[PDB]
Amino acid sequence: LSYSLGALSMMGFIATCFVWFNNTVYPSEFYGPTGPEASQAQAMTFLIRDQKLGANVGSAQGPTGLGKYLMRSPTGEIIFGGETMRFWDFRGPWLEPLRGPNGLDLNKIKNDIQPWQERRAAEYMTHAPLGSLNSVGGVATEINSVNFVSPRSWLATSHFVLAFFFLVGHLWHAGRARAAAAGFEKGIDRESEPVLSMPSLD
Amino acid sequence: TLTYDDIVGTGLANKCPTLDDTARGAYPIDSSQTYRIARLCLQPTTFLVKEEPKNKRQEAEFVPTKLVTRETTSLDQIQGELKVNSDGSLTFVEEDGIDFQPVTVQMAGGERIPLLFTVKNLVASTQPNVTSITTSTDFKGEFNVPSYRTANFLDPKGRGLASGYDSAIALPQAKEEELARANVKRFSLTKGQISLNVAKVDGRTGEIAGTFESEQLSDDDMGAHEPHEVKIQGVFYASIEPA
Amino acid sequence: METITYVFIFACIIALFFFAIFFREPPRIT
Amino acid sequence: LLFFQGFHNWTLNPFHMMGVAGVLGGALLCAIHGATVENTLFQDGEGASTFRAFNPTQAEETYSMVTANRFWSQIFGIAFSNKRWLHFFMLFVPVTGLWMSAIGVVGLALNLRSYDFISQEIRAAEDPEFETFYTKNLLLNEGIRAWMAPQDQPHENFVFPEEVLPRGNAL
Amino acid sequence: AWKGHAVFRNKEGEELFVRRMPAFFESFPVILTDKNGVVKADIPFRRAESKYSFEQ
Amino acid sequence: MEVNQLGLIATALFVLVPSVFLIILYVQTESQQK
Amino acid sequence: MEVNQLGLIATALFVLVPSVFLIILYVQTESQQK
Amino acid sequence: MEPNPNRQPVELNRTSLYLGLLLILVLALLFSSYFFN
Amino acid sequence: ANLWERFCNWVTSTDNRLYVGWFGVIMIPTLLAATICFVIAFIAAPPVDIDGIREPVSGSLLYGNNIITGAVVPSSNAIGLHFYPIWEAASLDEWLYNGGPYQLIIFHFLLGASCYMGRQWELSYRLGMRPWICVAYSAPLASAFAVFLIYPIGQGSFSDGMPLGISGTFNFMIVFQAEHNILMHPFHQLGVAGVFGGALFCAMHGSLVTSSLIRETTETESANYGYKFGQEEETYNIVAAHGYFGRLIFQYASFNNSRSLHFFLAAWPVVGVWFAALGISTMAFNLNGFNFNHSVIDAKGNVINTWADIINRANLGMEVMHERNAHNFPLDLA
Amino acid sequence: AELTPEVLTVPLNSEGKTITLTEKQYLEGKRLFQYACASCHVGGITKTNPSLDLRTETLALATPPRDNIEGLVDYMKNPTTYDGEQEIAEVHPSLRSADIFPKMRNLTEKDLVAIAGHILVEPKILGDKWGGGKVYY
Amino acid sequence: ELVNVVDEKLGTAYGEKIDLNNTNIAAFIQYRGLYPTLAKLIVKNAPYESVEDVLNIPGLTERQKQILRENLEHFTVTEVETALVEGGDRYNNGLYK
Numbered sequence A: 001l002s003y004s005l006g007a008l009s010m011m012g013f014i015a016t017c018f019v020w021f022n023n024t025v026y027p028s029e030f031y032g033p034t035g036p037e038a039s040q041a042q043a044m045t046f047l048i049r050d051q052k053l054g055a056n057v058g059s060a061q062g063p064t065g066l067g068k069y070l071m072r073s074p075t076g077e078i079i080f081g082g083e084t085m086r087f088w089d090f091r092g093p094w095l096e097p098l099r100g101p102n103g104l105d106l107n108k109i110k111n112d113i114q115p116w117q118e119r120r121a122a123e124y125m126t127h128a129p130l131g132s133l134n135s136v137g138g139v140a141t142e143i144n145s146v147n148f149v150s151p152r153s154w155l156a157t158s159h160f161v162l163a164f165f166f167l168v169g170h171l172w173h174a175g176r177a178r179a180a181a182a183g184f185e186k187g188i189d190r191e192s193e194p195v196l197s198m199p200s201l202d
Numbered sequence B: 001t002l003t004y005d006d007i008v009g010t011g012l013a014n015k016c017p018t019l020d021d022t023a024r025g026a027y028p029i030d031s032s033q034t035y036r037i038a039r040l041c042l043q044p045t046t047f048l049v050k051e052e053p054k055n056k057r058q059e060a061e062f063v064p065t066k067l068v069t070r071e072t073t074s075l076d077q078i079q080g081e082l083k084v085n086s087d088g089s090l091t092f093v094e095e096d097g098i099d100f101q102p103v104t105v106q107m108a109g110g111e112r113i114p115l116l117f118t119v120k121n122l123v124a125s126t127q128p129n130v131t132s133i134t135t136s137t138d139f140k141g142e143f144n145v146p147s148y149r150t151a152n153f154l155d156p157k158g159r160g161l162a163s164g165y166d167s168a169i170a171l172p173q174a175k176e177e178e179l180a181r182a183n184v185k186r187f188s189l190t191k192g193q194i195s196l197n198v199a200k201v202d203g204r205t206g207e208i209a210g211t212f213e214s215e216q217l218s219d220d221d222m223g224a225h226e227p228h229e230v231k232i233q234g235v236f237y238a239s240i241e242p243a
Numbered sequence C: 001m002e003t004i005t006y007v008f009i010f011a012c013i014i015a016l017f018f019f020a021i022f023f024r025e026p027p028r029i030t
Numbered sequence D: 001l002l003f004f005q006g007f008h009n010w011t012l013n014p015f016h017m018m019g020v021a022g023v024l025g026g027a028l029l030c031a032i033h034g035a036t037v038e039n040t041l042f043q044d045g046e047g048a049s050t051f052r053a054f055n056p057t058q059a060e061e062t063y064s065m066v067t068a069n070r071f072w073s074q075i076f077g078i079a080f081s082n083k084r085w086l087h088f089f090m091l092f093v094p095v096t097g098l099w100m101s102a103i104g105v106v107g108l109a110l111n112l113r114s115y116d117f118i119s120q121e122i123r124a125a126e127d128p129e130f131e132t133f134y135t136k137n138l139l140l141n142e143g144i145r146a147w148m149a150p151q152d153q154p155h156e157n158f159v160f161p162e163e164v165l166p167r168g169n170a171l
Numbered sequence E: 001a002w003k004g005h006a007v008f009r010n011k012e013g014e015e016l017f018v019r020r021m022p023a024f025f026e027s028f029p030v031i032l033t034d035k036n037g038v039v040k041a042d043i044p045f046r047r048a049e050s051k052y053s054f055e056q
Numbered sequence F, G: 001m002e003v004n005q006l007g008l009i010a011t012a013l014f015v016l017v018p019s020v021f022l023i024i025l026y027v028q029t030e031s032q033q034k
Numbered sequence H: 001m002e003p004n005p006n007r008q009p010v011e012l013n014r015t016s017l018y019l020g021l022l023l024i025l026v027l028a029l030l031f032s033s034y035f036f037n
Numbered sequence I: 001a002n003l004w005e006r007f008c009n010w011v012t013s014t015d016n017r018l019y020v021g022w023f024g025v026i027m028i029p030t031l032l033a034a035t036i037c038f039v040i041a042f043i044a045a046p047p048v049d050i051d052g053i054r055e056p057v058s059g060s061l062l063y064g065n066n067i068i069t070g071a072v073v074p075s076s077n078a079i080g081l082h083f084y085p086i087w088e089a090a091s092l093d094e095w096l097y098n099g100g101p102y103q104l105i106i107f108h109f110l111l112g113a114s115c116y117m118g119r120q121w122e123l124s125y126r127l128g129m130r131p132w133i134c135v136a137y138s139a140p141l142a143s144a145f146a147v148f149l150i151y152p153i154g155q156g157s158f159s160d161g162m163p164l165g166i167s168g169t170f171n172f173m174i175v176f177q178a179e180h181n182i183l184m185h186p187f188h189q190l191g192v193a194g195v196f197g198g199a200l201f202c203a204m205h206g207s208l209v210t211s212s213l214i215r216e217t218t219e220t221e222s223a224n225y226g227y228k229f230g231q232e233e234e235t236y237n238i239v240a241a242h243g244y245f246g247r248l249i250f251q252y253a254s255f256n257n258s259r260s261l262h263f264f265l266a267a268w269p270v271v272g273v274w275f276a277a278l279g280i281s282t283m284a285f286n287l288n289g290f291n292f293n294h295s296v297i298d299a300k301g302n303v304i305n306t307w308a309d310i311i312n313r314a315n316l317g318m319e320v321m322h323e324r325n326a327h328n329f330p331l332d333l334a
Numbered sequence J: 001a002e003l004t005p006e007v008l009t010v011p012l013n014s015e016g017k018t019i020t021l022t023e024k025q026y027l028e029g030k031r032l033f034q035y036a037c038a039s040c041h042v043g044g045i046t047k048t049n050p051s052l053d054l055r056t057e058t059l060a061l062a063t064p065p066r067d068n069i070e071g072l073v074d075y076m077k078n079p080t081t082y083d084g085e086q087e088i089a090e091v092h093p094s095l096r097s098a099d100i101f102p103k104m105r106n107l108t109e110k111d112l113v114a115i116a117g118h119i120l121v122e123p124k125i126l127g128d129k130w131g132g133g134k135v136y137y
Numbered sequence K: 001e002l003v004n005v006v007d008e009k010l011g012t013a014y015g016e017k018i019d020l021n022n023t024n025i026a027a028f029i030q031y032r033g034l035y036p037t038l039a040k041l042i043v044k045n046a047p048y049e050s051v052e053d054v055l056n057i058p059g060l061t062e063r064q065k066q067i068l069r070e071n072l073e074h075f076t077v078t079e080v081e082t083a084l085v086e087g088g089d090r091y092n093n094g095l096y097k
């Protein structure tokens, strides 16, 4: 039982990461965008808007000195700017048409962004897996109005909880299995206390 | 024919394209034709910072630094007009592109030097009578260097130029004068100068590659301290096109 | 001096760990 | 709590910190003592559930203090050897903790806060590249104060126009 | 020495009053109202949409 | 940094005085007839 | 006056460390039997 | 562990304490001017 | 006996002043590495660009920090959840600029502490004890995983892991409140009941046992000398203590079973802290505290504020001010 | 304070004609706005473009005017840029683009009128809160 | 002598009207018909020596010229301030709601 509890713990942690990051076996069409996905989608959304307003997003310098919309990954790939710089490993069917061999392609960004992409990015940006325990969508500071907590949050959180308690269960039943097999799970034999037959530590 | 997944994580993304050593031909310029640079890439390989000596009469030198912000330094996807001038010289006028990178290098002893490595608003011309772009062709010109931080940037006490506190609020009754330079943010805008030496030419593809040396001021922390002089050396790539 | 002080107090604490553990009064059963 | 963070920087206060050490240390001792007693029990019954194997009137210790002592001496380096000291200590740590926390709050009654490190402020005021978690947290406090004050302190009739509200980029 | 009493006026010559710092506050914005507590000027954090700057 | 200049002597006595107290009691305890 | 800033602690420790040494020795001598 | 037989008890009588303290204090009173400088 | 056999016998020896054991084989080097790197960095590491916006934060003593402000600063946002060992940096200077010491320390520490738990199991086995002390230790360990590993995974960057420093810890708590409203999360509330309660019961148990100590000493000596290490007799009258507490409340609110009582003393704080850890761990995937913002509304539709809305204002302060140069777009999505 | 007929009386068109909504209509409007619009327009702002809000004064200065029922219903059929120059059904929910914005498929004229009325009445309740964003929370 | 240039510019006509040479594009939402088409044309073809020069943007329809004429009273021009126009800040100046 303890072996299987350890295994199930492991699998629960794994499933947590799976539903949280993967959008292949957990399609965002059904489960909603991943966290990375929605953050990226915001970057995309505002690039599209400002570029429509006439901004050159490739040369736009943000307040930090890093590009406001586009910057480089630690290995040089062109990636979205702002905090979503952390999420540059994200890949998804609505973003990949804008990706060239060196990452995000500036010409493709200027000329090739289809309306369906704007749509998808807006949708995913506005269904990020953020929300409250009573299912108020958005950041903790958002007012009541949108009834939404992403299925990815529900699945990830539930299964991290279960995986954790199942790890605990594995320690419990493993330790007990050892003690009982060795015959001291009910306690120490007063007339045969092992430590009393041991040389002192000092 | 490498794909994004071929390249990702390798460092190749921050490298400019190279031309084979067979690229030693000439790319003819038709003066009745207009041209563009469809892609200009600049990959810095060395960053040097001019030491600031004490006697102020010694020959100050440029000294090597250690790059600490990783393979995030190259300028790429730059495009612009390539004008055929009356005297046969070509002037490249930079329109747009990823034409800046924040860079921090470290000098011996640990002093960190941030700069906006850039060629923003580059205007660079060749010698007269460039009937063909060759390994003897070179571009020299000037660019702009805006503040390393733009107007919204807030320092660690929340002070800034277009936003933020305009005082040292933790020192409510200190005298203002001594802290003016730190309290009043300022936006530098200076010139830089650059040379591109063409080393290779594919006259058929309109491709040229070579080395470049550029020079510009570093970050002045929105006016709080003096910038350093930086010299940047590297390789460049450009694809010339009829427009 | 600040740093020297902080590092010194820390070092004293680590030394105290050493003595309290390896040079404790041994517990004895009666 | 949030008011005390934003206005008093209460977490910076060494008396609150002693409080925290007393409550968390208290909780730790609670846990470690209970667990240790439960895991050095003498087998005093035949049951696999070992709670009935204890008589409230019995004279003998229900767990082995000697085994507990060796166990922790080898696990952690030091161990209790004296039961009376153990239980006194269990009284001492949380009681002392709460008392220190009290002293700190008595300070906060007068706005006698541990709000700043003066050297920190002199350095940061002169040097706009000097940043620590200390100055970061003060920026947070400033946000808290300005954004919560008007509704939290309505008798003051605060009206802070938008343009004066401290905000970072975008947010 | 006392610098003397500061009286603030706007371009239209209305007297303006600085809102005093309550003891609770380590720092405090600079806000100027008229005698009816109506905001008339301030020192803006963000400038891009400032309406009440001393300059304006 | 511009620290309080009494900080050092304050910290120094804060440690040394009580520590010394304790050391004195300990050592005279050890020396008592076993 | 512009005195050496380390003077205070130099003097305080100069007094305290060997004085404490002596006191420890004395008190533990008194506590010995006979 | 066998006890070390080279152990010897240590002593400082009250007169030596007074003499020693007088030495330390008088030295401090002498050198402190030079420490402050 | 062969060499490996002897080695195994030493490793698992019940006679080593500090028990080694196989878990200890992994524990000792990893914890030494984490410790040494942590001390050296805390003293002498240069500023770290925690949020990947070229705005390095100073954490070490030599670079302007004291004990309260100092920290080993989390690795750069640009790194994200990427593995950044020393040999991935072009230079130690780069490594340090980008916050490598942090990853080195928290990974060696997390491995090490996990092995510490396992080692508690191991020694309990070697001494013929019951095995579950380690289970109690699983609660603080899980907490540590929550703030050093899990939350970074959920938010997609070790730059949001808890800083190794005092003030940085406070930074982490305040930002966590801003974005997750953790105070209004029932698992954090269970955590508070866990530690407040554990403190309470610590004091209560301590004081009750102290109250019922059997007279064995004079007034001129410490009562502690009335207990002798290893004595078979219990050193206090639990009947007297039960009579006391039982009468303080009522009889059947009190424990007459020392085993039951000590089991309670283990279970309450351990379970509470388990919920605290699960709180951080699930707020890692942005399932946040209760949102009752604008929940009460009058007959026209005017918002009638509750204390929840004041909390919300405070949270807004923290939200807008935190990492003031890091956001370019209106929604802070991670 | 109550949700009175006067609160529920809003401009029908540009020519000065008003319409008075029932409380049922108000309820329907809040429900349908939450159903089809709140994901971006919670509180009267616009998450994917914060420069344009749903304040009546903002809607009034739109082209064509959107500060009345007809304007809002038309917008929900054929949305335009703020200047009216571009038709943006392809990136903005509408009956015209109910094929790519499927939540618009089960919306009837009655529904659109309800949503319009919600957008017009709510600022009469919340005031600056409506289109205010976090500052006014 | 140290000056916050932005504060200083708030004391010019910049603090009073839409500065065709400097102001962030979202300001054009203040008035009927200007955003986003004319606003993009205006910011793109900046700077202008006088306000009326905005009428000379190539390609303008007569309607557009009429709208601009109707709003010249709301426009100003001052010297290009680098701090306000670098970083693409005329298109996105880090301000949302």
Ligand code: CLA
Pocket (backbone or CB within 6 Å): A133, A135, A151, A154, A155, A158, A161, A165, I271
């Ligand atoms: C994998 C597990 C899992 C997940 C991820 C979900 C997720 C969801 N459920 Mg489902 N459901 C589940 C199991 C799950 N459920 C179970 C077991 C039942 C039978 C009770 C249901 C019956 C059900 C109904 C009837 C409904 C849902 C709904 C939902 C949705 C809204 C959730 C919500 O508001 O919860 C509220 C949050 C809580 C109640 C908090 C739970 C906290 C638990 C009790 C803590 C327990 C900790 C641990 C297990 C205890 C260990 C003790 C320790 C000492 C060892 C969400 C997508 C709703 C929906 O929208 O449907 C479309 C809905 O109406 N669920």
Ligand code: CLA
Pocket (backbone or CB within 6 Å): A008, A009, A011, A012, A013, A014, A015, A016, A018, A019, A155, A156, A159, A162, A163, A166
């Ligand atoms: C509270 C009880 C509870 C509930 C209600 C759930 C619910 C869920 N779990 Mg969780 N789980 C739990 C406890 C729970 N779990 C615990 C305690 C653990 C150990 C920690 C796990 C470990 C776990 C993992 C690792 C995963 C889940 C997953 C899931 C989801 C999918 C379940 C599934 O499809 O199984 C699968 C069904 C079976 C295994 C039974 C047989 C399936 C057959 C083979 C299907 C054949 C299909 C095929 C198409 C047929 C075609 C025929 C053809 C000829 C035409 C579901 C929401 C999955 C998930 O979504 O994670 C996010 C997942 O990956 N659970």
Ligand code: CLA
Pocket (backbone or CB within 6 Å): D001, D002, D004, D005, D009, D010, D011, D016, D019, D020, D023, D024, D097, D098, D101, D102, D103, D105, I173, I195, I196
């Ligand atoms: C690591 C996390 C942590 C921990 C462990 C603590 C710990 C503590 N905090 Mg701190 N706090 C923290 C983080 C933390 N804090 C943070 C990040 C902040 C933001 C700055 C604060 C802000 C804060 C404030 C503002 C205060 C504390 C206080 C305290 C102390 C409260 C002790 C107590 O039990 O009072 C509980 C109350 C009592 C013990 C009084 C008597 C209670 C009676 C007996 C109740 C009787 C109940 C009755 C029988 C009926 C009940 C019925 C039921 C229905 C309710 C304790 C040391 C308090 C303090 O320092 O006080 C001196 C305090 O005022 N903290």
Ligand SMILES: CC(C)=CCC/C(C)=C/CC/C(C)=C/CC/C(C)=C/CC/C(C)=C/CC/C(C)=C/CC/C(C)=C/CC/C(C)=C/CC/C(C)=C/CC1=CC(=O)C(C)=C(C)C1=O
Pocket (backbone or CB within 6 Å): C006, C007, C010, D017, D018, D019, D020, D021, D022, D025, D026, D028, D029, D032, D033, D034, D036, D037, D065, D068, D069, D072, D073, D076, D078, D079, D080, D081, D092, D093, D094, D096, D097, D100, I039, I042, I043, I067, I165, I166
């Ligand atoms: C290089 C440099 C400079 C690095 C610096 C690094 C750095 C950041 C340092 C931080 C500085 C620091 C540590 C600051 C601490 C700040 C702080 C708040 C201090 C509080 C001090 C103070 C007096 C607080 C007042 C409240 C108070 C009294 C708290 C006491 C807390 C306390 C000591 C709790 C005990 C916890 C503990 C581990 C107990 C172990 C007990 C034990 C061995 C149990 C095992 C056991 C159990 C049994 O049941 C039985 C039967 C037996 C037999 C047995 O053995």
Ligand SMILES: CCCCCCCCCCCCCCCC(=O)OC[C@H](COP(=O)(O)OC[C@@H](O)CO)OC(=O)CCCCCCCCCCCCCCC
Pocket (backbone or CB within 6 Å): A185, D034, D035, D038, D039, D048, D049, D050, D051, I132, I133, I135, I136, I263, I266, I267, I270, I271
């Ligand atoms: C069966 C339910 C298990 C629930 C989760 C585990 C709870 C106990 C774990 C604490 C471990 C502490 C450290 C070791 C301490 C230790 O060593 O344990 C000692 C103690 C005594 O052990 P015994 O050997 O006598 O019995 C355990 C087995 O051997 C079975 O006989 O163990 C138990 O009492 C098990 C109790 C099971 C039932 C407990 C349920 C209590 C929680 C119920 C849920 C509360 C949720 C509230 C949320 C609002």
Ligand SMILES: CCCCCCCCCCCCCCCC(=O)OC[C@H](COP(=O)(O)OC[C@@H](O)CO)OC(=O)CCCCCCCCCCCCCCC
Pocket (backbone or CB within 6 Å): C010, C013, C016, C017, C020, C021, D075, D076, D077, D078, D079, D080, D081, D082, D083, D085, D086, D089, I018, I224
């Ligand atoms: C594998 C190695 C793992 C552990 C390595 C490190 C262990 C260090 C443990 C503490 C050693 C010092 C103990 C001195 C004190 C000492 O020697 O204790 C000795 C004492 C022994 O108790 P007894 O019951 O034997 O004493 C009975 C009578 O003598 C009473 O007078 O132990 C306790 O009192 C336990 C409760 C206090 C435990 C306090 C622990 C504090 C933890 C550290 C907190 C400060 C850290 C600051 C970091 C900067």
Ligand SMILES: CCCCCCCCCCCCCCCC(=O)OC[C@H](COP(=O)(O)OC[C@@H](O)CO)OC(=O)CCCCCCCCCCCCCCC
Pocket (backbone or CB within 6 Å): G017, G018, G021, H011, H012, H013, H015, H016, H017, H019, H020, H021, H022, H023, H024, H026, H027
């Ligand atoms: C890393 C740095 C560590 C620093 C540790 C510092 C420890 C320094 C210990 C040095 C203190 C020694 C004090 C011994 C004090 C002391 O034990 O004196 C009495 C002692 C008598 O020795 P007996 O052989 O009688 O032994 C009796 C035993 O009880 C003593 O252990 O004579 C000496 O030790 C020889 C040196 C005498 C020198 C004393 C002359 C002082 C006269 C007054 C001088 C000032 C006034 C002058 C006026 C102009």
Ligand code: HEM
Pocket (backbone or CB within 6 Å): A122, A123, A126, J033, J036, J037, J038, J039, J040, J041, J046, J048, J049, J052, J053, J054, J055, J058, J059, J062, J066, J072, J075, J076, J080, J081, J082, J088, J092, J093, J115
């Ligand atoms: C729901 C059906 C819905 C309504 C109703 C609605 C209305 C609406 C109006 C009236 C405007 C014009 C605002 C003004 O003139 O000031 C407007 C503008 C935008 N909206 Fe919208 N909108 C509804 C739904 C949605 C959804 C779901 C989104 C996000 C995906 C969205 C976004 C926007 C955007 C962007 C704009 C600005 C458009 C532009 O001028 O370029 N709306 N909405």
Ligand SMILES: CCCCCCCCCCCCO[C@@H]1O[C@H](CO)[C@@H](O[C@H]2O[C@H](CO)[C@@H](O)[C@H](O)[C@H]2O)[C@H](O)[C@H]1O
Pocket (backbone or CB within 6 Å): F016, F023, F027, F030, F031, F032, F033, F034, G017, G020, G021, G024, G028, G032, G033, H008, H009, H010, H011
């Ligand atoms: C910060 C400044 C620090 C300065 C500190 C200086 C440290 C000084 C250490 C003094 C050491 C005293 O050493 C102490 O000597 C006495 C004898 O004198 C020993 O005492 C031993 O001998 C005596 C004989 O009279 C017996 O009565 C006693 O029972 C026995 O234990 C102690 O076991 C030992 O601990």
Ligand SMILES: CCCCCCCS[C@@H]1O[C@H](CO)[C@@H](O)[C@H](O)[C@H]1O
Pocket (backbone or CB within 6 Å): B109, B110, B111, I040, I044
């Ligand atoms: C035994 C290891 C002690 C820690 C080593 C400290 C880093 S080395 C240290 O680095 C500084 C910044 O570059 C230099 O200014 C300084 O000269 C140099 O000694």
Ligand code: OEY
Pocket (backbone or CB within 6 Å): A083, I051, I077, I155, I159, I160, I175, I179, I322, I323, I326, I332, I333, I334
């Ligand atoms: O909180 Mn708010 O949210 Ca998690 O990212 Mn976005 O800002 Mn930032 O990098 Mn540390 O921190």
Ligand SMILES: [Ca+2]
Pocket (backbone or CB within 6 Å): B135, B136, B137, B197, B198, B199
């Ligand atoms: Ca050449």
Ligand SMILES: [Cl-]
Pocket (backbone or CB within 6 Å): D136, I171, I175, I321, I322, I323
């Ligand atoms: Cl922060």
Ligand SMILES: [Cl-]
Pocket (backbone or CB within 6 Å): A081, A082, A083, A084, I326, I327, I328, I329
């Ligand atoms: Cl961002």
